[PDB]
Amino acid sequence: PSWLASALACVLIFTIVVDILGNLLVILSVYRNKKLRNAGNIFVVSLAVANLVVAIYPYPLVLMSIFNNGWNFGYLHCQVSAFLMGLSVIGSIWNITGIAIDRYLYICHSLKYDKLYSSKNSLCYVLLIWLLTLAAVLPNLRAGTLQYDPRIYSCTFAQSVSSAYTIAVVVFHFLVPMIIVIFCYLRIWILVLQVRGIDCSFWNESYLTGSRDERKKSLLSKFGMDEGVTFMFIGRFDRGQKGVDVLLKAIEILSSKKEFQEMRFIIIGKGDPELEGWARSLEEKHGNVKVITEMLSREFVRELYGSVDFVIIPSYFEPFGLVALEAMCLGAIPIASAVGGLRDIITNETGILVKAGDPGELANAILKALELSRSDLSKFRENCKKRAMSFSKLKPQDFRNFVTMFVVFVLFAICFAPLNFIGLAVASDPASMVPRIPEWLFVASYYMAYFNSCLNPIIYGLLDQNFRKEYRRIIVSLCTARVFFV
Template sequence: MALQGAPTHSPEDDNDDYPTWMVSTLTTILVVTISGDILGNLLVITSICRNKNLRKAGNTFVVSLAVADLLVACYPYPLVLLAIFNRGWRLGPIHCQLSGFFMGLSVISSVFNITGIAVNRYCYICHRGSYSRVFSNTSTVLYIGLVWTLALAAILPNLFVGSLRYDPRVFSCTFSQSVSSLYTIAVVFIHFFLPITVVSFCYLRIWITVLIVHDRVKPARNLQDHAWPHSIHSFITMFIVFVLFAVCWGPLNIIGLLVAFHPPLADAIPRWLFVASYFMAYFNSCLNAVVYGALNKNFRREYKKIMLSIFQLT
């Protein structure tokens, strides 16, 4: 593990020039994110395990996505919170590298899982005949293993190029966009824009299929099968998850791409915009559980049962 570029504490790491209200705001956002992340994603995983209507091959990716979100809430985010309290990094280079590594692993595995969900929904709605063969229980588990293997392979190079560094603007050990323009461009395209393109294609094809089927079956007031309305509802839920991910992570990746193409922009980007883009990205990890609960009655029902059980125990 290369530690080149990993910081030890120095005076310039402190954020004493941040006003108290801003530190308080960032702290509040992170506390809400960590709390919502842990509670929400544990509810998601427990709900899928408890409810047979939710134990489907497609929801295996949902569990994997929840695990990816939980990963950052259990280690990197609490360290960011400590850095905010201390107005600088006090935990040494090893924790800095590990924090940046697990944060990157979570982000990359999240976007790969979202891609897996989109491909799964695409096959289910657009290629129903071959869906059971392509997404059997065994093959789906293998796909999940592939997602995490690819995510691990994608983040490992950062340990050897010195790109995981403490950034005092966001109190985080994270990917440094200024290490190498070519490397940053490759990271942004392979880890964000390429998966987003695949997901966009899948959902575009799904929307076209839904509209065609709707026009064909409307006169007869008949649907292909009883599962069709549920599959459309599930598709809409996962589409919103994708949109939220793209909205939350898009600004940070666009900034990284602009800086990579034109490095002098790094000093021109307002600090508030850079900080806002980071914390908006962080906040995404607690949103998925809310979307499932708001749009899926099976998740909503299980959430209520689990919470009632917890309250009864206390």
């Protein structure tokens, strides 16, 4: 591996200079730019320090130790250069975990309130992380798991010294954050999609005509059944997806009760012809249950939302669930099973929540829904309308900062995924798998993780226009131009 030594010098040389100047601009830009000066980006400076620390002291020692092919400094230099690298890399996730949490709170808050989320505790909240990162890394001095490795020319955490410490490192300081940050950004993506796909000019009460009671008496008279509390299912028919099967079991459970007489059901959809035969059966047996097996226009569906009292959404899985939100626009109060999407949308004040896949709990919800007077429903419909209106409030917003912080996270995971994956293979049998693991894969896994300390400024430049507009200002002020009297 002759040239493979010289190459490893380049990678660090790049990494140290880019990290030094790059993350120096990131601190400057946040202090210098009023748009980037918000307290939510306190985490970005804390992260840019963590990146920037390992280029002042550790990577210099490791760069020299490549050209030496050996450690030529003290054991303290080895024990301390290793220690700062751990304060960095562990702090760099737990910062990134904070950012992912911060921006989840930012979206959820801005739905519920009309005065931007302030990130009020962020400086105080950073000091919890740097205690958490100092508490996790500090035990490795006394246990003696920090030692020089000749393959990577560096002093670092030896995985093979104790598999108790590696598995604890890998689970608690990679897999636990990885799960938190995926969960955060996934639930953000659902909400930003729910925002994207809600046509407010279509799903609007304006397009309807009279009062509600009159429009309902019309709709029910149009199907040939009397006045009553009306319920509506509208989703394709299937044994386990959108949940028409749970509804039909629930209607049979209700049919015997005295309170059934005061109910009206309007089932819409097409799919399993046996479930269509089961629904058509309940149509023939009871005149208060109507079943519509063909394709209705969204024009007409709008009116049904506008006319009925409740919309039943008994879905097993339902990732986005606009059907709930669209219906709330026109005062339809959803009774809907707790699912990702519906748990985000439906609050406990707007509509009713049910344990998914249960005829009895759905029936007792329909019974709970029934025991509700005309005056009591008015506020529910108001809350439903206010709730759907908050999703359209976010439609024109700039969502690019979510991408910039997510791309930070994605590139982090890529760099440290190998090192943590290897660290589990080492943990299985330290004696066996230190030689058995491919020797290039060990070297690559480490030098990506180092290279990650120069990547944050490069990403902020390309994706966030405020940072790029400030790199122009920061660079063109210091270096470019000066005073000059004519």
